[PDB]
Structures are given as structure tokens and as C-alpha cells.
Amino acid sequence: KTYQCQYCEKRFADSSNLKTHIKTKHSKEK
Numbered sequence: 780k781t782y783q784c785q786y787c788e789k790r791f792a793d794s795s796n797l798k799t800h801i802k803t804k805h806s807k808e809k
């Protein structure tokens with residue numbers, strides 16, 4: 780129905796939001 784992350788516990792509304800999320804919060808801890 781919805782998509783979620785596997786690194787942290789955040790949710791997204793499409794697999795587009797998620798696609799960016801990762802290099803926002805999981806950008807090599809920087």
C-alpha cells in the first residue's frame with residue numbers, strides 16, 4: 780500500500796520519495 784525504509788524507521792508516499800530519502804538521512808552518515 781505504502782513504502783518504508785530498512786535503515787531507519789521512516790515511511791514514504793511512492794518509491795520516488797524513498798529514492799531520495801536515502802541520500803538525505805543515509806548519505807554515508809554525513
Ligand SMILES: [Zn+2]
Binds near residue numbers: 784785786787801804
Ligand atoms: Zn531511512
